Amino acid sequence: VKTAETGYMSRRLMKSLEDLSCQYDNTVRTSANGIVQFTYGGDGLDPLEMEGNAQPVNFNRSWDHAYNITFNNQDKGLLPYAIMETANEILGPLEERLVRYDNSGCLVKREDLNKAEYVDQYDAERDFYHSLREYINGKATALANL
Amino acid sequence: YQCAMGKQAIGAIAYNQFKRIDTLLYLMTYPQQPMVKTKTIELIDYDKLPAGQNATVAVMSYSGYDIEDALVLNKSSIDRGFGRCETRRKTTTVLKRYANHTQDIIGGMRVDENGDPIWQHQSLGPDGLGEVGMKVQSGQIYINKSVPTNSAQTQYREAPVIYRGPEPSHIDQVMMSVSDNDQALIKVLLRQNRRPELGDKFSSRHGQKGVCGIIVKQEDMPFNDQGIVPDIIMNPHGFPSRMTVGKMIELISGKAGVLNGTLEYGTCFGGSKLEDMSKILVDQGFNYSGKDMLYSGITGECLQAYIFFGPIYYQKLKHMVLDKMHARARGPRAVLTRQPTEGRSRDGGLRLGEMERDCVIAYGASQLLLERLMISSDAFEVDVCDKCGL
Amino acid sequence: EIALFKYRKARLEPGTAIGAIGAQSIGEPGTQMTLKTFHFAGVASMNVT
Amino acid sequence: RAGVTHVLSRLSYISALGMMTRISSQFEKSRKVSGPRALQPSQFGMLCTA
Amino acid sequence: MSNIVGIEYNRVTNTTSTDFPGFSKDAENEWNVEKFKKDFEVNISSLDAREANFDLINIDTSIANAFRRIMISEVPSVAAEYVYFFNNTSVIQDEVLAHRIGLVPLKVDPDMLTWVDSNLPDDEKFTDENTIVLSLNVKCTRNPDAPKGSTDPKELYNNAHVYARDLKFEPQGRQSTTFADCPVVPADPDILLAKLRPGQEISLKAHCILGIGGDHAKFSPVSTASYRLLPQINILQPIKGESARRFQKCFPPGVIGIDEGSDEAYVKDARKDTVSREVLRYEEFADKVKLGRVRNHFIFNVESAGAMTPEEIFFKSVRILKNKAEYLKNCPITQ
Amino acid sequence: XXXXXXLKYICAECSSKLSLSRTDAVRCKDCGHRILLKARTKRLVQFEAR
Amino acid sequence: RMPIMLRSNKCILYDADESKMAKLNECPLDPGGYFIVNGTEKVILVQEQL
Amino acid sequence: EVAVPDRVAKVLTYPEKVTRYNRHKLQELIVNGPNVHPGANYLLKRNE
Amino acid sequence: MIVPVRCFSCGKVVGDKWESYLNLLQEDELDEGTALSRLGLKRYCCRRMILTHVDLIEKFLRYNPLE
Amino acid sequence: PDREKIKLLTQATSEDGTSASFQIVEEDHTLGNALRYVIMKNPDVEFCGYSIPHPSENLLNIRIQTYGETTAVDALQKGLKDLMDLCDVVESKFTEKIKSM
Amino acid sequence: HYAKIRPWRTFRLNECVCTPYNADFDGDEMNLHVPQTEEARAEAINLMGVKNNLLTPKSGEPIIAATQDFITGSYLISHKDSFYDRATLTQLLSMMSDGIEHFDIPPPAIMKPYYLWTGKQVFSLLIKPNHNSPVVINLDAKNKVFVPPKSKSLPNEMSQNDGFVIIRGSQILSGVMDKSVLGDGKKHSVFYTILRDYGPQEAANAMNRMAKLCARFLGNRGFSIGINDVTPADDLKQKKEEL
RNA sequence: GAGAGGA
Ligand SMILES: CCC[C@@H](C)[C@H]1CC[C@H]2[C@@H]3[C@H](O)C[C@@H]4C[C@H](O)CC[C@]4(C)[C@H]3C[C@H](O)[C@]12C
Ligand SMILES: [Mg+2]
Ligand SMILES: [Zn+2]
Ligand SMILES: [Zn+2]
Ligand SMILES: [Zn+2]
C-alpha cells in the first residue's frame, strides 16, 4: 500500500527538479537560466564528499593521519606559539584573498566587517578557516597547559 | 510466503499426468514424501503426490556463494538425480475446412539428394507429424502444415510449425483426432528433461526461497564421521532475522524420525515434541541438538563449530533460469513507433523507462542518454524545412 | 594541507545534475518510510502525522 | 462481472487444490483502504489466517 | 594441544597442524624421511569383499584428505555413458531410464580398458579395447496361469520388472578373449531398473566407457570414502559410584564400563564412540571428563560399489597422488 | 576396433494398432473412439547417461 | 447442453472407485468442482459480497 | 565487474571500428566466427 | 517414479533394496526402522532415500495406453 | 614435455626468485593442500599458500616465498620430491601391511 | 560494470555491490545494457562506474561495503580468541589474495610459547599487504555494541569487549571488525577511509581482498545456527514466568 | 484483450 504512493511521489519530485545544474559561476540554475540558488546549500559543498557532521574535514581523523604519516622519533616538537605562527602563516594568506566588498562595491572599513549587513559568498570559507584556526589553537593550548 | 510459493513447487500432479496433454506441466522425476508430515497433508493426500525431496541440509556458511538467500547445491547428488525435473508443453494445430471446400494438408517430408530428409525435416516423419521419441532443435519442423492460398488446391502456402527453443526437447506424444464439427486437430506434446542448473529457485517450506548460488563437487564438501555430505548447504543468516524456529525443529524432528525409521508430525499447535526427538537423537549417538561435528572437505580438518546437520524437505520451484534468460541485439520492431517489441516470445529489448532515465540524468551522462534513448532505440533521418518547421 | 585539499575537493563540481540528486535523495527514503506511530514528544493525546 | 472463471492451475497438486476453495473480494483495487485487506479476528476458523 | 583437538560444549579447539619448523623458536619437525618412515603406521581392521576399515597413524590431515578426495573423484571407473534406444514403450521417459542405467555400477575391473578420445567421430571413437557394449531387451506379456486377480504383479504379468541383471554383455573382437574369465556384470544385480505392464518393451544398447569420479557421480568407485579422528576420552578425577552409571549412559554402550568390584568408570574402547559431547551437557562432569580427538590418527572406512576391492582403491589413490606429484615435477617451469 | 553403434497409430481406448489411408477416416476400428496416438518411432534414438 | 461440473450428481465420476476412474483416464485424487469447456479446465471462484 | 553468460555474450555484440591498432584482433575474431565466443557476428564494410 | 538407484548424499546403491524392504514390511512384519537397519542402511541418507519414497509408478501403470 | 601444466607468474615473482607464484592447470585442493603441507615443512620457506581463483576454471595459484638462500622454484621442486617420498612411504607400508594381514 | 564471461546462465555480481541494487538472490532478475559508442561507454565507465559510486549521494555515507556473512567472517577472524601459526596465516593471506600479492609477514604477536599471530594482524595485512602499497590508514571508530570501560577516566580502547577500533599506520591496534567498521552507513569505516585517502582503486582492492578472504574462511572455519542457539536456559523459563 | 504467479 505504500510502494505505489512512494513511486508516484518520487516521479513528481523528479519532474519538478529535473533540470537544475550547478553552473560554472557556482549558482544552481534551472533550464530557463532563472537562478534559484546563488550558492548550493549556502556553501557550495557537495554532500557526497563531506567527511563530518555538516563539516567537510573531520578534524580529528585528519589530524591523526597527519600525525602518523609524519612521525619521526628524532624531531624537535615546536612550542605552541610556533605552531600558531605556522597556522597563521599558512592560513591567512588565503583569508587575505577574500575582502568582503560592500553591496555598493566599496570595501568595508575593518570596523563593520561583522555588521551582519555585509555578508555574502565566501563567508563559509572564512568560517571554515576560523574553525581550522580554532582547532589548531585548541591543540596548542592543550600542549601549553601540559 | 510458504503458502504463496507452495503452489508453484514442481512435483507430481496426478496419476494420469502422463496421459495428459496440458499447456505447461512441470514434473519431478523422483518426488519424495516429506519427513516431517502434518495431520493436514494426510487428509489432502499430499503424501501421495508430493512436490519435493528430503535434502540433507547442513546449515553453515560455505564457499561464500550463499550470502543473500543463495544456496550451495551439491554436485554428485544432482548427477545421481536430485531436483531433476521435466517440462511438458503442448502445441495444437487445427486443420480448418474453409468455406471454399478447401482443407489444410499436413503433407511434408521433403528429401534432398541421395534420399534422406533435409535438416529442417530431419525429425518430421513420413506423415508430416513429428516422430514420437525423436529430438527437435531450433528449426526442426514437427508439424508440416500447409494452407491454401485461395482460402478467400494446388497452390499450398507452407506454414509449418517450428520448434523455436533455446535447448533441444523431445516429442513424446502426438494425438490426432477431430472435434464435433469434424475438423482435424493435432496436439503434439514436447518433453524437456531439465537438470538443476545454477540459478534455479529452491524453496524450503518455510518461506526461505533461494537460488542455486553454486554447484560444488562432493569432495569439496563437509563430511561427518560416517562420510555423509550435504545435498544443500543453506546459509545460517536466513534464521536470525526471520525467526524460522519451525525450520530448526523440522530438521531435528526429521533427523530423529529417519534415524528411528518413522515419519514425524509437524502440525499446528502440537506435533512431535522436541524432547522426544532429542532423546531419539541422543540414543543413536548423535548430539541432542542435531549439531554434528563435521570435517572440512578442502582442508580435511575439523570445523571449529558444530554444524546443524539433518534432512530438510526442500522443494524445487518452477522459476527456472532456462526460461528467464533473454537477450536482444537486433530483431523485430513495433510497426507503429519502430521500437523493439516488449515480450520474450518476441525478441525484444528491455525497457529503460522514466526512472532509469532519471537515474542516468542524476549521473549527468548526456552522451550515454542520447545513445540509449535515440541511437540504440529508434533513430530516424528526417528532413525539416528551415522556413516552416515541418 | 590535508584540510585545504579536502575542502577544495569537497565543492559541488560545475555541471552536476544537482536537481536529480536532490529529488532522488528526498524521494527514495520515502520508499522505506514504513508507518511508525508517533506522538508529539510525550503527549499521547496529541496525535501527529 | 468479469473474471468469474479462472483457468485451473496445474503446477503441483496443492496448487490445483488451493485454486479450488478460493475466495475473491468484491473490491476492485482498494488502493489505500487498509480495511478489507486486514486480518479480521472474526475469521478465526472460517478463513485461512495465513 | 600437542596432537590433540579438544571437543568443548560450544566449539572445537586446536584443529590446525602445527608440525612445521617456524612454529617455535626450536625449529623442529622439519621434513625428512626415515623419521616419517618409522612414525607412520597402518592397522588394518576388518576387511571385507566390499569394505575396508584401515587406521592410518601419524600423518597430517592434508595427506589423508588428499587420499580421500582422490579416492572419491580421481580413481577411474567404468559406467554407462551413452545409451541407444531401439524401442521404449514403458511409462518411464527415455532420459530417465538412461540415467538409471548410467548410475548402475558394473563389476568390470578397470585397466582392462583405455581412455576414450573425445576428438574422434562416433563411427570410430569407440573400439573393442575402449568401450564395453551392454544389451538390454525385455518384453512384458501377461501370465496365462490362474491365480487370484488383483494380486501382486509378479505372478500376474510375466517379466513385469526389469532389473539391472537384465543388462547383457556382448564382446567385440579381442573382448571375446580378454573378458572370457570375467564377463562384465552389474555389481548389484537386484537394482530395480524399471517396471512395465504387458504390451511394453525396453530394447537398448549402452556403450559403457571409462570415466573419472569428478566428471560424474556414476563414475565414483566407492559409495563413500571417509575418515574420522580417533576419539579420546580422559576420565580424570575418577567417577566411581552410582554416578558412574549415569556417566555410562551418555556414551554409546560399548565405549566405557564400570570396573567389577571397584565400581569405577573406565574407558573400554574409544573406537566405538561417536562424539555427541553428551557428558558436556550435565555440568556435573565439568572436571570429571575431558573429550578430544587424535588429530593425526584417522580410521578410514572405504566401501566399494562392487567394481574393485577397497584396498586396491586406496592403493590406486596413493599411486595417483604420487603420479600427480611426479608429473608436476617433470612438467617444465614455464614463465 | 570399432563398435558399430548402429506409420502406425494406436487407439486411445482399444489400444490397437491402426493404419489410416489418405482420406478414409480418423476414428478407430475395433471401437468408435475418435482419439489416436502416433506410435513411437522405429528409428534409433541416442541418450547420454550423463 | 449444460456443462457439467466435475464430480457432481450428473458427472459420471460421481461414485467411481479406482477402477471406473482408471478406465476413464481420471486421477482418483483430482479435486473436481471445475468445468471442462473448450477442453479447458475453468473453475468458478467463490465470490464474496456484502 | 559482472559475470555474463557466454550464451548472451555471443548475441550482445559491440561495434568496434578497425583502427590499425586492433585490425589483427578484429580479423582474428572474424576468423573465429559467430559460434566460438571470442568471435564476431556481423561485418559492415566502409562503403557498403 | 521408482526408487533412486543411488542415495544422493553418500552414493550407496539403494535401488536394489526397495523390493526387499517391502517384503520386510509385508511378510515378517517388522517396524520400518528395524527393516531399514537390517538392510545395511546405516547412514540416515540411505534411510530417508527408502523410507520417504512414494512408489508413484504403481499408480502411473494403471493408465497404460497399450492394455 | 608439457609447458602448460606449470607456469611461473612473472608479475608476482621478484628478482632472483626467493618469492614466486605458480599457476597450475587442471588441479584443485587435492594436490594444493598436500603441496602446501610439504613445502611449509621446509626450514627455508617463509610463506606458502595455494588458492583456486575461480571454480569455473581449472587453476591453482600456489605462492612460495623463501628467504635469501633457496629460490622458490627449488623450494617447489623439493616439495614435490618430498611429496613423492611421502607417497612412496605410505604405499610401501600399506603394501606390506596388507600382504602380512 | 566491466564484463566477464562465465559458463552459467545468471548475471553474477559480487555481493558487496548488492546493497545499491537492493538485490536479493531469491529469484531476482536484472537488466544489462551494452552501450554502442565510445562516448556512451566512456561516460558510463567514468561517471556510472562502481568504483566511483561507493558513496550514496543522499548522505555521502558508504553504501558498497561488506554485506551479511562478510561481517561475520571479519568478526570471527578478528575475535580476540583468534591465534594463527605461520602456516595458517600464510594460507589465509593466499586466500584473501589469489596467490599473487607479495606479503611482508610482520613479527608475531605472541613469541615465546609459540609463534602466533592475531586476526587483527591478518586484517592489517589485508589493508597493507606490502611495503609498496600506500594504504596507511589512521582511524578511530566505535562498533555497534560498545561497552565502556570500568573507569570513566579510561579511554575507549580499554572497553570491556573489543568495542572501540583503533587503527594506526594501517595496523589494527585494537578493536574488532564490525558493521560500523567494514559495513555501510558510517563515514568512519575502513573502506571509506581507504577510498577518501587513496582513490577508489585502493578501496576496491581492499574490498575484493576481504570478500575473497571471507568466501573461504567461513567454509574452512565453520559457523552454524542450531536449536541450542535459540533454546532458553533452564532458570530463564522460571524467571520469565515470574515476571 | 484480461487471470495469475514473480522480484
Ligand atoms: C596401477 C594399478 C594396478 C593395480 C591393478 C594393482 C597394482 C598394485 C596392486 C596392489 C599392490 O600389489 C599391493 C596390494 C597387494 C595385495 O596382495 C592386494 C591388494 C594390493 C593393494 C594390490 C591391488 C592391485 O592388484 C594393485 C593396485
Ligand atoms: Mg529478492
Ligand atoms: Zn517549408
Ligand atoms: Zn478403438
Ligand atoms: Zn547414503
Short mmCIF file of N, CA and C and ligand atoms in Angstrom, two decimals, chain B residues 56 227-229, chain E residues 223-224 303, chain I residues 6-14 41-49, ligand 5:
data_model
loop_
_atom_site.label_atom_id
_atom_site.label_comp_id
_atom_site.label_asym_id
_atom_site.label_seq_id
_atom_site.Cartn_x
_atom_site.Cartn_y
_atom_site.Cartn_z
N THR B 56 19.63 -33.43 2.46
CA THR B 56 20.46 -33.42 3.65
C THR B 56 21.11 -32.05 3.81
N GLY B 227 30.79 -40.09 6.69
CA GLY B 227 31.01 -39.76 5.30
C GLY B 227 29.85 -39.12 4.58
N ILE B 228 28.80 -38.73 5.30
CA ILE B 228 27.66 -38.08 4.67
C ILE B 228 28.05 -36.66 4.27
N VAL B 229 27.76 -36.29 3.03
CA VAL B 229 27.98 -34.92 2.58
C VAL B 229 26.62 -34.28 2.33
N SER E 223 31.21 -46.07 -2.74
CA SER E 223 29.99 -45.42 -2.28
C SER E 223 30.33 -44.15 -1.53
N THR E 224 31.05 -44.28 -0.42
CA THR E 224 31.66 -43.13 0.23
C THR E 224 32.97 -43.57 0.87
N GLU E 303 34.29 -48.29 1.33
CA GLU E 303 33.39 -49.31 0.84
C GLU E 303 33.18 -49.11 -0.65
N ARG I 6 20.78 -44.71 -6.63
CA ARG I 6 21.82 -44.33 -5.69
C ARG I 6 21.31 -43.25 -4.74
N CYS I 7 21.71 -43.33 -3.49
CA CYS I 7 21.31 -42.35 -2.47
C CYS I 7 22.10 -41.10 -2.72
N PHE I 8 21.45 -40.00 -3.04
CA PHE I 8 22.10 -38.74 -3.42
C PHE I 8 23.24 -38.34 -2.49
N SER I 9 23.06 -38.29 -1.19
CA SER I 9 24.13 -37.74 -0.32
C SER I 9 25.40 -38.59 -0.31
N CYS I 10 25.32 -39.90 -0.10
CA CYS I 10 26.50 -40.80 0.03
C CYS I 10 26.87 -41.42 -1.31
N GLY I 11 25.98 -42.24 -1.82
CA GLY I 11 26.21 -42.86 -3.12
C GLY I 11 25.80 -44.30 -3.03
N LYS I 12 25.42 -44.72 -1.85
CA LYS I 12 25.14 -46.16 -1.71
C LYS I 12 24.16 -46.52 -2.79
N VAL I 13 24.23 -47.74 -3.24
CA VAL I 13 23.28 -48.27 -4.22
C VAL I 13 22.07 -48.76 -3.43
N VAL I 14 21.05 -47.90 -3.34
CA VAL I 14 19.83 -48.25 -2.62
C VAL I 14 18.71 -48.71 -3.55
N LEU I 41 21.37 -50.26 5.77
CA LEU I 41 21.30 -48.81 5.68
C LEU I 41 21.64 -48.18 7.02
N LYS I 42 22.91 -47.85 7.22
CA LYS I 42 23.36 -47.28 8.49
C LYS I 42 23.29 -45.76 8.51
N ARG I 43 23.72 -45.11 7.43
CA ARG I 43 23.64 -43.66 7.35
C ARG I 43 22.22 -43.24 7.03
N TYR I 44 21.76 -42.17 7.68
CA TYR I 44 20.37 -41.77 7.57
C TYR I 44 20.01 -41.24 6.19
N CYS I 45 20.99 -40.90 5.35
CA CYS I 45 20.68 -40.51 3.98
C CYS I 45 20.06 -41.68 3.22
N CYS I 46 20.71 -42.84 3.27
CA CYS I 46 20.14 -44.03 2.65
C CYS I 46 18.82 -44.42 3.31
N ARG I 47 18.66 -44.10 4.59
CA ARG I 47 17.41 -44.42 5.27
C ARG I 47 16.26 -43.56 4.75
N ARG I 48 16.49 -42.25 4.59
CA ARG I 48 15.43 -41.40 4.05
C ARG I 48 15.25 -41.58 2.55
N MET I 49 16.21 -42.18 1.86
CA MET I 49 16.00 -42.48 0.45
C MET I 49 14.94 -43.56 0.26
ZN ZN M 5 23.52 -42.63 1.58
#
